[PDB]
Each structure stands twice: as C-alpha cells, then as structure tokens.
Amino acid sequence: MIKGKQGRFRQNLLGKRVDYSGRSVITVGPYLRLHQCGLPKKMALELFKPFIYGKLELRGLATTIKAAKKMVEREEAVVWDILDEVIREHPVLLNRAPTLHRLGIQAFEPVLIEGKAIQLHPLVCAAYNADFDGDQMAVHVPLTLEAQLEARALMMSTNNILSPANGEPIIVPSQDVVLGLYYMTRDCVNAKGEGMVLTGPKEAERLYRSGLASLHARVKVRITEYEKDANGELVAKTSLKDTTVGRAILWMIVPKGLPYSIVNQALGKKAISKMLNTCYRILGLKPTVIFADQIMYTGFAYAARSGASVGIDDMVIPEKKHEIISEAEAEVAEIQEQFQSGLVTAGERYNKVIDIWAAANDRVSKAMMDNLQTETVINRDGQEEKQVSFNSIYMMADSGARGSAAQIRQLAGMRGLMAKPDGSIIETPITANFREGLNVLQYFISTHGARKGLADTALKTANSGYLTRRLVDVAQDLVVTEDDCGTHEGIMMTPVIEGGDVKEPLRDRVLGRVTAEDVLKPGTADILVPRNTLLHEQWCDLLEENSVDAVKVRSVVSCDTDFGVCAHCYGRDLARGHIINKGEAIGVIAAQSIGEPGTQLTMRSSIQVKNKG
C-alpha cells in the first residue's frame, strides 16, 4: 500500500481527485470565438453553487444558507439571473483525458447554452487531438483570485498559439475551412465574368453575391496593399493586380500589414499555416487572434456554398490498369516458366516477382494520378485547353484537408503488396481497388494488416506512456533561475545532410538560440554579429546572405549555473518570440514534447552526384 500504481505515491498523493469538476461529450460549438467555449446550464448551475449562495446573500434574497439551497434547487427565474453574473469573467479549464503535452489542458471563458453537451471552438480541436466521435472532456473551475488571473494570463486559448515543441503554429485550420479556402482560391479558364475590371473587394463581394460572376474568374482588380517598410509606419500602395474574384473576396479578411503575395496562390493547408505564422511574426498577437477567428468563418461559409460532395463517378479507374495487369501476369508467368526450367533459383524468382509487381503497382498508380489531376479539359472561348482537375476526391487531397495520395492509391489503383503477419511480403499482390469489388481471398489477406495495426495501438501507447513518465521524472526539476552564466563554450551547429537534399539548414536549428563566440563574416577579421546576441529572424536572414555553415551556439549542456540552467543558455522560449523569462519550468516542457510524438511514431556500387559542383 505504498508502491505501485495502486500505492499512495501514485494514486493519492500525486493525482488527487478534485471537487468542482464535471464531464460531458463534445459538440462542434462553431459560433463561440476561440477565447470562449460552451457550457450546459444544468452543469454550470452545479459547478458554481457557492458563488450563487454568496450572490444571493448579497442580494438579500436568502436570509440563511438553507433558503439559498432551497431556491437553488427550485431553479426559478432569479437563480438564472444570478448565474449570469458569476459566469461573466470566470475562466474554466477544459481538460482532455490523455493530456500528453502542455496544450492538453487549456482555459476558456464560459458561454451558457441549453442542451447537455460541452461545445468547443473548432480551431482548438487539433491541440487537444479531440475528435467528435463521442469524446469526453472534463471541466474544472478555478476558485481563488490568483487562479482566476492565472487561467487568464497563461492558459487562455488565445495565449498559447505556438506549440512549445516547435515555433510552428498549433491552431492551423484543419478540415472544412481549409477545403473552403482552397475552393475559393482557384481559377476556371472560362467562367462568367472573365476579363472584367473590378473597383475593389467591396465590389467583388457584391459582383459574386449577385450571381453575375462566378467564384473563379481571372479578372483585374485594384488593391490597397499596406506596407510596414517604414519603421512603425504603414505605407499604402495601390496597384492594379491581376487575380480571381474568389481571391479578391478573401482579401478583406486579412489584416492590412500583410502583403498580397500570400492570398494569390492556390492556398492549400501549409500555405494557410504559413500565412498565420507570418501574420503573428510581423503583426503581433492581438491582430492575429482576430485574423485566425475570421478565417474560420470565411472557410466554413464558402465550403458550405461549395457543396463538395463525394460520388462514385469521382473515383475514376484508369483505362491502362487492365493492360498493366495483363502484362504483369505475363512477366510473372515468364519467370515461373524459367524457374520450372531450372534456370533461376526459388529465391531469385521470388525477388524478381516482388520487384516486377512493385514496378507495375507504381506504373498503375502513376496512370491513375495522371488521369485524375490533368485530364480535365475545357474551352478558353476557342479551342480546348488543359486545366487542373475539379474532382472532389482530388480536391480533398491537393488541398491537404484530409487524406494523401497514398490513400487515393487504395481507392482507384491497386492496393499493392500486403505483408504477412510474420513480416514477409506475399507473392501475389491484391490487384483490386476499393471502388471495384474485393475478392474473398484478397480480403482475408487484407485483414492481417488491419489486425496487426489495431493490436499495435495497445502497445505503442503503453510504451510511449512509460517513456514519457521516465523522461518527466528524470528532469522534473530544471528551472531557469539565473539570467546569465557568463560562460564561453557552446556546442557547434552545422547543417545535417545524408547525401540527398539538406535535411536541416543552419537557418532552422540555430534560430532561437544564442551564439557563444563571435561569428565572423566570410571576409576575415570582420565580426558580423557579436558573441552574446540572440538570433531572431532579422539575424538569420543576414546569416543567409553571408552563407556561413559553422556557428557556435551556447547550450544547456555547457552552462555552469548549479541547480538550474541560464536564460541565455536556453535561448528562445519557442512559445512567445522573446527570451525565456526567469523561472519558467523547462524541465517538464522538454519531457512532454519528446514523449508526445511517441503515439504516431512507428514502433518498427556507384554513387551518383546530385548537382554540379
């Protein structure tokens, strides 16, 4: 009764169950801003009972606590009015069940709703990794004044935009808004309203709502592109830029500081995330929360008007597939006849069969992809012209909304070669897709992989949990207590290449840290950057011009402060783009950020030059 997961140390001392709690299922909750979340009335009444008693006593409605309890149980009209007072500016903590990393438990401002489900802003349904297939979040309440202020200055959903693991944003638009934006930012070579001149976005939105011009149409518009080139000043330039009606409508949503070279492209998913990141970088936080809240409204509203549905005719089966199948059968038959003649060995024939089947699978996949994306053909007011497809299955893959080319390979082309439970590749691959019928044997073979993948969940999670626990309890005590070690030595940093393209440039690893010795310009005896200056984006851009490969960087391994790392030795906080404050608990942050990707992580001649040089 001391040791183990049942003992005191891990059941009653660390994880104490708490009062003022709750639980419910999740709902889309789209309308509430990303700083607020829904809450059923029948739950917020029970959570905030002492506050209601106190407010009733202040009003004089209840002489004693007994009468207050009676009137609370009555659920009459006065009680709801009181509840709409203690709920005004009282954050609550929406905590997901398996909180792997720091963003698991966030704060929200309640908005009372009827029903019996907890709503949730869609843009934060990614950090939680919370689906909507009946997931269950628990609601906590901060009681003391300090707790209320903390759940406002640290935990509000508008305060942690960038994840602590990496600087990239964590509120990237996920499924429907991204598809809507992608369908908005496109072009059909001939749609009504082509070649016209538009006064501005205020007029483009009207010309589209009237139905006089289609959403996609190459036109000429004028745009007031605001520039921050003057330090602290907004320079307004207006040039007649050529773009689509859909892109022009999207211009009004974006703030003024950003340039126009972002909303002009096809706007997949990574483009949207980069747009948010640049907005945060060059505009701050306050004008980025509004932008990220407005982008979801536009994306939903123009994915609803799209009617992006999936039909059987979408998943085209390439015509070349039958011929490819026949020729692959002929090649495997030739190898079989050779083996029956004793020319080749069993293993050699097996390897040849595997290789030719892989080649045929790649060939049929290429044929299907080329018949899926390009094959759209329309008129340009004259002869026929080529244009990227509008197939819904293709639009859900190019935009990155949901699914990649690998899954579509399983929907139209052949499934490929499947693995036996012991790790071997079966000789005959499954030559049937999902749109077509799947045979009995080709399904009994397929069930092996599904069973193995589903059984690996119950071990991947069980091992990642233990690794995370060990990593948490090994650091567990690192806190940035001193502002400057004053040391000199720091570990070297160089780009890492395996022989292909550069895996990580020096502009990626070094950014966010502090140099050890004075980095020198390629022209010798020239100190480009001092020895103890932090490296932000305006410095990394300079480092690109001079093209320096080796830069010394101070790191927490060479710091000399006992019982805690330095502030300079740790570099950028990676959550807010400023030097880490004196005190932040960095011991647990790293353990959580390393043990978090442990769920999706898989548990298991002549060298030709790349380029001239």
Partner: protein
Amino acid sequence: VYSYTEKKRIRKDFGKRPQVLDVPYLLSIQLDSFQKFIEQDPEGQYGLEAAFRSVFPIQSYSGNSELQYVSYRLGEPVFDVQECQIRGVTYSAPLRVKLRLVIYEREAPEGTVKDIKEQEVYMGEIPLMTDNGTFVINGTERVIVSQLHRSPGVFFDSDKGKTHSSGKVLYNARIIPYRGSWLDFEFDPKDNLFVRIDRRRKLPATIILRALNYTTEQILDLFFEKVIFEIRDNKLQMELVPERLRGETASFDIEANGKVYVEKGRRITARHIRQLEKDDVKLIEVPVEYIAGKVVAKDYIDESTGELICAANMELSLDLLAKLSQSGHKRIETLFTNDLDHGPYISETLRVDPTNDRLSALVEIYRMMRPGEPPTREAAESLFENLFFSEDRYDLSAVGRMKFNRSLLREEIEGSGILSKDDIIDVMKKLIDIRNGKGEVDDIDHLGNRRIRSVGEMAENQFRVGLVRVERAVKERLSLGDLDTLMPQDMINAKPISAAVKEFFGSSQLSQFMDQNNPLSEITHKRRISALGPGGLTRERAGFEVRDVHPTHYGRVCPIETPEGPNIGLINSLSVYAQTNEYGFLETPYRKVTDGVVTDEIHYLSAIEEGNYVIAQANSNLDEEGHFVEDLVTCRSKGESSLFSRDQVDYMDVSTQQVVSVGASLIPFLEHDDANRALMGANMQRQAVPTLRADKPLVGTGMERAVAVDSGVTAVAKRGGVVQYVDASRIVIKVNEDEMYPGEAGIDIYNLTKYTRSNQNTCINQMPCVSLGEPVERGDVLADGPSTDLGELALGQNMRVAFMPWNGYNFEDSILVSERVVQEDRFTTIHIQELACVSRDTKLGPEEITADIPNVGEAALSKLDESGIVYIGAEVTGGDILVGKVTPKDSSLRVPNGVSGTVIDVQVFTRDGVEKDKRALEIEEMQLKQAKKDLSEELQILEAGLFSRIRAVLVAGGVEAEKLDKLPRDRWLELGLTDEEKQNQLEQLAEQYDELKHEFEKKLEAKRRKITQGDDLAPGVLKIVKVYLAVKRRIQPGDKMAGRHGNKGVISKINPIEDMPYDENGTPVDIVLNPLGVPSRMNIGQILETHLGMAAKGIGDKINAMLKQQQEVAKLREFIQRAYDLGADVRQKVDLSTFSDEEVMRLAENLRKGMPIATPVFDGAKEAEIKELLKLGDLPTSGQIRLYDGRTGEQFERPVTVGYMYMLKLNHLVDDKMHARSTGSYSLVTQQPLGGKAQFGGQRFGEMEVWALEAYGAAYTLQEMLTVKSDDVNGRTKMYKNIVDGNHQMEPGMPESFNVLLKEIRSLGINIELED
C-alpha cells in the same frame, strides 16, 4: 413457392451464386452442447453418467462396504423462467440419484453381500438452460461463452532466438494432460536433455528414465545403434556398414580384401558409398586410434576377478581396451556417435546424471518435488507412481489420447488415459529426431491445436470436482460408522456438490452477464468464444502472434470481428457455418468434387484435414452442369492461394459468406470497405438501442430473416393453422386437422411479453404481426420482437442523407439532424429503469414503511397512497418521493435527479412472519384474480376448440346435430354414439377432459398457495419493494449516432426544417453528413450504399404514386414484375403471375415505403445493376442532384450526393454523461471526490494533468487542485465559508493523504518525521 408471410413483403435479391446449404440454427452450438450434459447416455461417455461412473465406486478401505450408482433423473423445476425472474431464484431442477448400498461379510472380498440397500437421495441443485440458451442464476439472464484452450497432448516448441543469445535453437517438448501435472523435456546449449515437471527446477533427463526400472545398458540400447567390434589376430578387424559410414569424412583410407575404395583424407561421395554397397563388403580394417575414441556400448567384465573392464557409456580407454583384449571378450560394442546425424545427447546427460540406481533416482525426484522434506523409501515410490501413473491424479482425455498418438505417428485412436513407459521414451525419441533434423516443430496457434470447450464440458468438470470432494467425505465416513446401521443418505451431503456448481455458474470469468441491447447482441454473445478464463492465457501473458489471425481461420472463426482495446484478437467470434467437431476442434463445410463435376453432397472438414487437400474458391463460375467453365481455377492448397487445373480440385467452398461472423455478415457492401473500419462497423451494431417504431433496413444483406427467427425475440408458430383470436397480449391459433394429434390436440396459445426491463434498461416488447382469419404456416413469425419488423432484423431507421459541409456544424465527425427527425419521433426510445427500497431490521427497532413522513409538506404526500406506496401510473420527476421509509430516530426512497418517468408497476415482497399491509393485500388479490381469470380463459377457449373438434366426429356416425344441441354441449355422453373407430377416441377425449377438470381444481389451489406464501429473503430484511420507472428518452445534441459501415459521430444541432437543404421537388433532407471522412478512412461502402438506398426509395415513390391515384391492378403488377427482373441474371427469379391479384395489392402497400434490396456480402450487386435500377425510376444515373440552400435560398454548385442510409442510434446517450459536482461525501483517506459514478464524484486530476500544470507557470491553481479542493479538512470548510462571504482567499493546510503516508511508513519500523 412462397409462404404467406413471405408474400407479404418479398425482398428484391441480388446475387449470382446459387447457395446449396441453408445457414444452420445459429444457437445450435450451446443448446446441443448442453443437451449432451443432462440427457441420459447408456453410452455414459461425456455425460452426467460419464461423470458419475468414475466417482461412484465407493469402497471403504478393507471395510468390505460398497455403494454403486445405478440411475439418476432430474425432478420438475419448482419455478418457471417467468416466475423465477421476478423472485430472483435460480432456474434450477433437483437432482435425484439412486444409490445401491450392499454389505459384504468380514474378510470376504469374494463373499456374497448379506443385504441390499436401495434408495433415492437428493444431491445438488443443478441449473438449467432456457429455450434460447440462457441460464438464470439470480433473476438475471446469464450466458456462458465457449472457451478455446490448448488441446491436451504433446507439443514441440522451438524457442528460437533470444535463448542463449548465441543464435542457437533450444528444442523442447511438453506433455499437457487434461487433469494432472505438466511434464516438459527441454534441451540445453551444452546439448543435454533435461526433464522438468510442473515448471520446477531442472533435472537431467535420465533421472526420469532411471525411475522407470531402466538399466544403463537398456537406456543405451534404447537410443543408439551399436557398432560391433570383434577381436581378431588381424589388427582388430571390425564390421563396417556403408550406411553408417555415409556422412563421415575419411579419417583413414578404407580398404577391403586388399583393395582401396575411398582414399584417406578425401570426403566420401555418394557414388563411393554406392559402389561399397555394390561390393557388399562387411568387415573393414581399422586402426587402434579410431576405436579408442569410441564410447563403449555395453559393460565388459573379466572372468578372472569378475570385475568390469570398461563401464558402459564410458569413453574407450586403450589401456582399458588392452585389459579387455587380454581378457578376450569376443564381441566389443560401441555406440554409433555421429555429430551430423546421430547426435549423442543421451551419453552426456547420463554423465551429468548423479545417481546410479532406481532408489537414488526416486530420492532425487522426491527431493526436487517437495523441497525440505526428508526422504523415505515408501513416500517417494508412492509419490512417483501417483504423479503420472494414477487413475485419479492423472487422466488424459480421449481427445488427449488421440492427439498424443497422432503426434507420435501411431495407428490406434483409443488407449489408456494414464501415461505409459513406452510413451515417454517415444516422446524422447521424437525430440531427439527433431534435434537431429528429421521432423518439424508444431505451430501452437494452428487451429488444429486449440479445441473448443462449451458450457457442457465445464459444467461436467465442476460436477466432477464437487463429486471428488463429497467422495473423500463419504469414504472416510464409511470406515468409522458401523456397517448397516443407517440409510445411505446420511453418508452424503447435497451442499458440497452444490456450492461447487452454483459457484461456477454465479461467479466466474466465463459466466458473463448477458447484454440484450439487440436481437443481434444476444446472438453474437452466445456465440463468442474467448481464450481467457481458467486454463487459458491472461491479458498480460498474451503474446502478439496469438492475437494475429492465422491462415487456418478461413471458415472456422471470424477474421473481422474482435473487440478493440486490451483484449483484441483474444475474443474472436465464431463464423456462421462453422460447426464443432466431435472431439472439440472446429469444422467448416465444403462440397465434395468428383473428377469434373461438383456434386451436391457436402463434407465437413477439420482444421488439419483441410491442409493436404486442394480447395477451390466460391467465386468459381459454374455451368450448372457441375463442370467449371474456365480452365484455371483459383484454389487454396497450403495456406497459399494460386492457380490450378480443373481436374486437380476436389473441394469447393459451400457458400460465399462462410468466412465472416453473424454480425459482420449484416453489413452490405462489406467487401468494398477496409477491414479496419468493418471491425468497428460490426462492433457498432451490437450497441444499437431499439427505437420506438422499428423500421426495416432499406438495404440489407439478406441475413435479416435468419437472426430474428433464430434468436428468441420473435415468437415463431410451432403448428400450422388459422388465427382464431388475436390481441395485444395473446395470440390464439387454431391448428389444422393433419398437423394435430388425434387426441388432446385442441389449440395453441402464445402469450406475448409486454414491456419488461431488459438487462440494459431497454424495453422488451412483443407486437402482433397478424390479423383475424389470416392463415399461418408452420415455422412462421407472428410476433415482432424488440427491434424487429415483419420477422426481419431492423435495428435502426433509414434516413435521407446528403453528403456536404454545412457551415461547419458537421465539422469532422459531427452529424447534423433536421427537426423533422424529432417531430416524426423516429428516434425516441424507451428506457425502463428499476428501483428498489429495502426495509432492514436494524437495532433500536425496525424501520417503518408507512406514509407518515415527518418534516415534509403536503405536496409530496399527494403522490402517495395510504400504505406508503406511489400510485401505479403517476408521473414522477427528479427528487420526488416514491415510497415512504422513516428510520427509527426520512430515509424514504427518492427518484434520482434527472429521471422523469411514469411508474408502470410495483411488486412487493414480504417475509414470512411479518404482516402484509393493505397494498400488499391489494397486489396479492389482483394477482390471484388474474391467475384465476387466466386459468378460466384458457379453459373457455380450449373448450371452444375441443368442442369444434368433437362436432367432426359427432357428424360421422349418423348422429343429428340438433339433438346434440338439445342436450348440454359440455357433456355429450347422454347420447349413445354409434360404435366406430372414432367413438373410443371421443370417449377417451371426454374422460381426459374430466381428469383435466380434476387436475385444474388442484392446480388452482396450488397457484393460490404459491402466490400467497411469504417469499424468502436475505437475512435481516422485513419487506422489499421494487418500483419500475419508464423514461422515454428523446434525441438530443450529444447523443451518439453511427451507421453500419463504421461511420460514427455525435449530433451537433437540431436544425429547423426550413433551414435544411432541399432538392428541386421540395423535399428537405434529414441528415447532413461530412464527406471529408470518406477519403481518409476507406469505408467507401457507405457512399455505395446511399445510391442503392436512393434507388430503392425512388421505386417506392413510383409505386406510391401509382397507388395514391386509382390504378388498374395490371399496371402495378407489370411495373413490379419489371422491377423484380432487373436486367442482369439473379438467383431469385420471383414470378408475379402466380399471385392471385389480391395479394399484389397488399405487397404494394408493404412496398410503397420503398422496396427492400438484398445484397450478400461477397457477391453483391455490381454498379451496373445499381445504375440500371436508378434508370428504372427517374433519378439521375450519376446519383447526385442539385440541392438548394435553406437560408440563402440560392443554388448549390457542384451537385451533391443524396440518398437513404441506415442509421442506428448507439446507446451511449448524453443523459448518462453529465456529472458535475461541487461538494459532497468524502472517502476514508478524505480525498473528497470519492470517485465519479452513480455516487457523486470529481473527475480525477490525474498524474499527467499535474505535469501539464507544471509546464505552464501556474502554481496557485495547482495548489488549489491539490490541497483545498481535494483533501484539506481545515481548507475545505474554510474556503466554503470564504467564498460565500465574498473574498476568494486560500489557505494550503497539508493533505490528509500525506498524513496517511507518514503513518503507513511510521508503522513499518521506519521513523520518518519533519524538521522545523
């Protein structure tokens, strides 16, 4: 031809492959298995009799007293299923055993017994199995899942890899008995055989051989080929056989008769060995350097001093050889050691052997078996012969003998159950062969090595355990008591056998609670076979190759359905056609194939017999003449599909759905979606709560008319005839003349079970499906059960579904639902819930049940009668008072918060001795009157039927009908009926009727007594009252809703009807799904089911339009015939020209809602037929129509998909999820929340949430999560006053859990304190 109910709604069927074998009775695995456990077997094998035989010899040790079992029978059950469910007493039957006791004379084993004592004794209370295969234990329906455990016998593992960390393989053998101790032979890296019993410490293998009276010479001869040397004056000439020389390098040049064949230092070739054999030379010369390295075979002694020259199994010594040479033993023997082939793994083990005699080996065995126990010359002997060679302490089953003799390549099947001396050495030789290279290891996961154990075998084993305990008692009693002084009942006790059977049935890892969420959940739960339980593997001990699906699962078990989570792949469900062998293994039917023609007679093939054969595939086109139509047919020979010729095959699959389970076979277009999603599609059907108005599936597989009938929900008529009187609670059928017995046939009555609580708080209701005068055929459904329409499984309700994003209200898995769904009440399910108030007998006086509740108002007592019981029919809500119970100085039962239902019935149980109150008297009198009315109504209707039968004979024999009317109808005996063959039958009928009257006048009193008698109860309770609430849960944002194909998601908004999108004609859709879930998770079947549903509803709309206006019957008939033909060839081919043109107008009514469509799983409808069906009506071929936005009113570009999809409502409703609490009861460790459940609780601020708090800078909120909120006796009571005061302060205190840990360490002899 078609049955009458088949003609009511005949389902359009797809499919091209004509099935041959109808699906068997689904539950026939449990019913038959239990039928072999209580039914009499003169054979007495695997029967209650086969269990008695072994434990019934009864012999007092040298006491000349004998008792033998003779016969047994089961008494009539005291209570029926219905009458025992309410009382909670197990549905049991007394076990009466006849025992014969005889007394011999003193010291006369052969002498005749002086007297015979025979009587019938009552022992045990064995339960019984209901008609559906469910055991009743304590008023709760319980089902016992079959187990799948490693079969008794012998297995040779390999233990490849990690052992010894040097790339070596350690072969091992085990002898697993059915009841006994495991015996394991295991090799070692040093190549020494080691015997290990019961997983104890190791032991050299020869030790267990020495214990079997085996000499060293015998042991050596039993494992090796001896090479014979003969002393000669010719350089010690030796006999060399070429076969042994094969595989040996030429140590020295080999010559015979002065001619050299194989050169020295050259590897001997097979050609060289062949020419040696051709020369047929026997003796070959050998240097003395080759014999010295040869280990001797037999002990050689000198005849002068008598002592032994060289010991056997001793390496030859040249000086020892010289002593042997001078002694002159004409024959010299050595064993043929050959590291390549005949590895000497016995000689080295014998060197390791520490003993030399049998007694020493037995002493070592006793020392190892029982450590710390001093040896004894007799104790070891008894223990060794008891461990293995004892009939009682070791028993291999007949299946064990079969498997053990098959693995050893024997010929016989039946043999002794105890291990034999030769069997052990045969196992040893097989292991040595495995090591040498011959033979192969056996795969554990092979489904030919895991038998199935149903309920009957487990019950028999438990009965045997009870029997051996009672036998140990009775034998000891028989020795002490004087002979023939008492009846044989006194020596035996019923309870020891009972507390052994009832313990198994009640509490076990296999006697699981039965879930009744659906007619399919019951079916798939009585079929599930699990590998857990006693004698099986646990979750922690479960590896990863066991969970994987073996190649030998094809047709024997479902490769799709397995519960996710911890026990994944361990509880796989049985297939649809698989039927258990006689030994326990699994069998799957196949069709016998002659040289060219595939016959009709089918064969059941075992798990191992399937291997050596070649089996064709169900998707093999046939000419209907029996010959295959192509030249190359795919098959499955060695677990690897390939192509073969027509003449090679000799077996084909019986059907196309024989691989999948029952539930997984209900998914239409199953083959189109990935197995990962079908695994959840088959797991989200057994959780679909039954709705209010059950609706047939617009697109179903075709196995819906076989799950409703085969389960128990429906009420199939067992006799054919006509319906005489239907009603909402009873159906009376008048049987025909031929189908009825000549005497006492009468008529048949079915009683329908009205609203009764199920094990999952869902309603169980029966609704009539017929009308007066409608003929009813044999084996036909006429009582639709819960979630069942027209005898066709119907779990959900088909809904018009459109795939499109709608303003984010169906974001990533949400499901938008129109107001039209709630308005039609298409998903408002019933939820019957049961409450119970108990009146205990505490000190200071028992509690009162009265209605005089102190300190309560007049409002609460309005809903209470005089006796303190709520009126049957009131509408109670949360917090209302149900029954009044005042504790002896307010403990009255109250409705739990949130529940708002109507009381449907109240049943009051009273203990004998205490007085029944007024309400109890009212209930008892009501039940008595109802019982009398039932016994009178049955007689009135039966008399009507019987007298109707009597008139058939009364008109045969020249008897006028009017005179029979003149005399009283009840008694026609006044007239003299003409003598005939029917007069005697009628007189027998009348006499049986009179005897029946005398029987009823006693059964009435029996029922009177049964209702009136005070029922038994737990000790210390006076009366217990049960109150039933019937809530009607509606649909709500948050309630789960899942399709059949594996798509799930909660409802997000109940949109008003006008806001929904609508097609051109004006009909608004009812559900708006999110398409973005289809490409990521390949469940593409559902997109290909919506089109079929839309086609079906389009044909339904066309039929409805033809019906709404008056139309000639021929118009409807020709259109429906066209619809049923539908282009591509199908198996069904149903004709409408034979219908009488009046059943067509009824079929049209049953089809106007939309014609159902069948689709067998793996030969379903091709997309061409779907396109043709779509073109049969009007809807566009592609399957997408131009919707219109509801709010804006504009048009939707890129037209979207519309159609009808079957959508179940999962029972994970949101009303059972919200829990939030502020303050309440605390635990012993003062961790206040006490655990979120029915009792108040706070969600656990778990270990990871503390880290998530520490990652931020938040510490004050962490402190308030850890001290004030959770456990601080001076913190909670302080801040509860601070908050209501107005200031939100904090005081940490220090958690009580730490003051508990301090005590739990201080009480350990360790002083832990705090400084200051």
